[PDB]
Every structure is written in C-alpha cells, then in structure tokens.
Amino acid sequence: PHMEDENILRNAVNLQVLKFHYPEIESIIDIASHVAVYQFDVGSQKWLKTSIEGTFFLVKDQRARVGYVILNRNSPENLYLFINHPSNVHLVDRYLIHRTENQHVVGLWMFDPNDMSRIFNIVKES
Amino acid sequence: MSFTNATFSQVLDDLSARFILNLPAEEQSSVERLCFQIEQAHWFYEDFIRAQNDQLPSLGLRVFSAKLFAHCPLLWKWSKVHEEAFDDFLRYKTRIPVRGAIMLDMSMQQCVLVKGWKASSGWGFPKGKIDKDESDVDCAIREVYEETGFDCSSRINPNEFIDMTIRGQNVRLYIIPGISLDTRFESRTRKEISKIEWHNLMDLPTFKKNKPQTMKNKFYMVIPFLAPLKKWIKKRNIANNT
C-alpha cells in the first residue's frame, strides 16, 4: 500500500469524479474544503441561503474556460457555473459574489477564510 | 440522471471525494468527523444514488463503511491503526431515536406520505424525534397524530416495524396496514407540514424494478424502507392466504 504522494493521488480521484459528471472538465485548478452557496433573490429583497453545500472545485474547461463545481452534500443537484469575465466576481466580507448568465447573483461562503482570497486571486487571472 | 449508468466502484469514488476525501487536515484525523461523513455518504447512497440505478445494492451502515474503507487506499493507513476505535464508535455512537409509522391501506399497495412547506421538502413517512422518558410506541403515536391528525393508538403493533440506522438516526417505522382510504387527515396540530396524500407504492422508485423509474417528486428517507416493506407485505399476503 505504498503511496509516494497522497495529495497527488487525492487530486487524481478528484478529477476522476469531476470527469465522470462533466466530461468537458480538463483539469482542477484549486480546491476548497467546505463552501456554502447563497443566492440573491431576483426580487431584490434579501440574501437567501440555498440548500447547496459541499466541496469547491475550481476547474478548467477543455476550451480553457475557468469555472467551478460544487459536489453538493445534500442532493445530487450540484453547482456548475463558468466565469466568463473576472469583472463578474467580487469579494465582500467572507463571500464570493458572482454575476453569471445575464442577471443572477450567487454568493459563495467558504469555511476556511484563506481559501476565499486564494480562489479570488486565481479567478482574476482568466 | 447522474448515476443512471454508474458502476459501484464509481459510486464509491464519488462518495469518497464528495464527503470524506476533501475534509481539512484536522477533520480527517477525527474519528467523530470521519464517521459523521460516512453516515452522510451512506444516506446519500441509499436515498439518492440507489433511486437512479436499481442495479446498486442496498447496504447497511456498517457494511457500507467496510466497503468504502477498502475502496480508498488513503484510508488504509488510518483504518489500520484506528480500527478498534472506529468500530466501537460506529456501533456505540449516541444517535437520535426517531419513531414513525408506515400506514398502509387494506390492500397494502398505498401508503400515507407527508410533505413540508419548504420548496425542497420532499415526501416522507410521518416521523419525529423522541422525547424524554417517552416510549417507542408512544412517540410513533404522537408524531402521527401531530403530523396527520390520525390516532393510531388502537392499531399500532410494537412488533411490526422496520428499524434502521440512517444519517445518524435510529429510525423505527411501525407498519400499520388496514387504514381506511376515506380517512380525513387534518394536521391542525403541527403547521410545519403542507400536504397529506396517499401514494401508490408502485410509483416509488425502488419498489417496482420492472416499472420505468421516473422520479418527478422528491422523497426523503423513503427509498431505504421500500426493500424491507416490500418483503414485509409479501410475507403478510402469504400469511393471510395460508
């Protein structure tokens, strides 16, 4: 049961699962341990919390597009969104605002605060 | 539609990365936190993954845990030294006792399901946590009377039930057949449920392997009880005609 690097092996089966759900995924850019998903109501009322919550996978598409996948721990319905432009992603407090698909606002609350800024700086690079 | 054509090794691959592989450093070293995710992975396998693929077998918590450990070599180092500490915790963990009832009709092909008010609240059997110094039968009667308005005190049998530990809960649902279909269910006691309707057992996912599995409505903690309930009704129809 020898393993020269357990983290490379951990990320090997991680990409194996992401390709099983989305074959267009080419590689993993970064991973966040625990991430909760919030959704801003289109009625412009309050900050509703979505039932989506799981591991955050910063992923790169076959077309070199940079998006993210969230394996939901509460339902098979995962979250797969692409970041078309860095001007759509902002960082407010311990949230990661993202305006995707014309008018829509999703907020990513990450458990580890160091993961939020690291992902945010990578998103600003394509 | 996600796990329709998924092998059992791929399912263990998904549940591994989804629940137990990407925890932080201190959480993976914790027996309580590692056991908590495995119980969640077991419930996720029974309630969701099996409904999308009937080929996958129904497993118990202790059996599912054993296959998942041998599946991932990253836990072989952990399970070799923390074997006795984990097996004692998985068996003796304090779990929330929940009691309920599976009310069937006279023909034993329609059951009573209850649904909440939340948009994502799925259908489930009337159950709930037990109170202090409360009996197993008394808790099931109370939860049914509160969530459905029907008093099954004169019909509940302490020996006819399905007991199963799932998602960190010791669940025991007492099977009560012969409920009149004309029963007026009024959940005036608890305003946290919305609808109470009879559901044909054949319409639930895992009950009828021959029928095409279409899962248009959501079900919560209903699929894992279908395999024992199908076996239970099969033995009752034989015992009624012997």
Curated annotation (Swiss-Prot), chain A:
Subcellular location as annotated = Cytoplasm; Nucleus
Which GO BP annotation is one of this protein's? nuclear-transcribed mRNA catabolic process, nonsense-mediated decay
Keywords in alphabetical order: Cytoplasm, mRNA processing, Nonsense-mediated mRNA decay, Nucleus, RNA-binding
Q: Which InterPro entries match?
A: Dcp1, PH-like_dom_sf
One Pfam annotation reads DCP1
Is Nucleus a UniProt keyword of this protein? Answer: yes
Where is it mainly found? cytoplasm
Cellular-component GO terms for this entry: cytoplasmic stress granule; cytosol; nucleus; P-body; RNA decapping complex
Q: Name one GO molecular function term.
A: RNA binding
SUPFAM superfamilies in the record, alphabetically?
PH domain-like (SSF50729)
User: What family does the entry list?
Assistant: Belongs to the DCP1 family.
Biological function = Component of the decapping complex necessary for the degradation of mRNAs, both in normal mRNA turnover and in nonsense-mediated mRNA decay. Removes the 7-methyl guanine cap structure from mRNA molecules, yielding a 5'-phosphorylated mRNA fragment and 7m-GDP. Decapping is the major pathway of mRNA degradation in yeast. It occurs through deadenylation, decapping and subsequent 5' to 3' exonucleolytic decay of the transcript body.
Describe the protein's quaternary organization and the partners it interacts with.
Answer: Component of the decapping complex composed of dcp1 and dcp2.
Q: How is this protein named in the record?
A: mRNA-decapping enzyme subunit 1
Swiss-Prot record, chain B:
The residues listed in the UniProt record as binding ATP, with positions renumbered to this chain, are 167, 220
Nudix box, short sequence motif: residues: 128-149
Q: Where is the Nudix hydrolase domain?
A: 94-227
Which parts form a coiled-coil structure per UniProt? none
User: How changing residue 18 to A affects the protein?
Assistant: Abolishes interaction with dcp1
Residue ranges, annotated region (Interaction with pdc1): 1-242
Instruction: Note the effect listed for residue 143 to A.
Output: Abolishes the decapping activity in vitro
- Cellular localization per UniProt: Cytoplasm, P-body
Name the family the entry cites.
Belongs to the Nudix hydrolase family. DCP2 subfamily.
Give the record's subunit note.
Component of the decapping complex composed of dcp1 and dcp2. Interacts with edc3. Interacts with pdc1; via N-terminus. Interacts with pdc2.
**Its function?**
Catalytic component of the decapping complex necessary for the degradation of mRNAs, both in normal mRNA turnover and in nonsense-mediated mRNA decay. Removes the 7-methyl guanine cap structure from mRNA molecules, yielding a 5'-phosphorylated mRNA fragment and 7m-GDP. Decapping is the major pathway of mRNA degradation in yeast. It occurs through deadenylation, decapping and subsequent 5' to 3' exonucleolytic decay of the transcript body.
Q: What is this protein called?
A: mRNA decapping complex subunit 2
Taxonomic source organism: Schizosaccharomyces pombe (strain 972 / ATCC 24843) (Fission yeast)
Q: What is the lineage of its organism?
A: Eukaryota, Fungi, Dikarya, Ascomycota, Taphrinomycotina
Parent sequence residues shown = 1 to 242 of 741
